[PDB]
């Protein structure tokens, strides 16, 4: 209990850096990269018992994942990859690993001051996305 209290709430994207390059490395095609890169999502995080729910809502897509820390799940990503995901808490950081087709990407979510900072890594390429409370 209270594991993720500082994450819970509704968060609005305020900045993004290198997301197009991250998406290229993941294999996202041109048209999806353009439309997804233009998205300004709200991220809605909630907790009920051991179950964490993360929603991303934008003009591009509305996604929702629910999961228990450490317990793998199947996820269809906004770009329509079918991935195996596992999310854990590591020293206060939510660490989300997605595996598909022999590839892997890791998305980290952390609280820093009044922001929620999301770092998306695929091999050598990192994208940083900053959110503030809505
Ligand atoms: C196109 C794929 C790679 C993608 C899309 C999005 C939105 C623009 C729908 C997101 S996120 O939902 O902003 O975190 C993310 C995060 C989870 C890395 C990834
Ligand atoms: Cl960007």
Curated annotation (Swiss-Prot):
Monomer. Homodimer. Interacts with PPARG. It comes from Homo sapiens. One of its GO terms (cellular component) is cytoplasm. Keywords: Acetylation, Cytoplasm, Lipid-binding, Nucleus, Phosphoprotein, Transport. One of its GO terms (biological process) is white fat cell differentiation. InterPro entries: Calycin, Fatty_acid-bd, ILBP, Lipocln_cytosolic_FA-bd_dom. The modification Phosphotyrosine is found at residue 22. This is Fatty acid-binding protein, adipocyte.
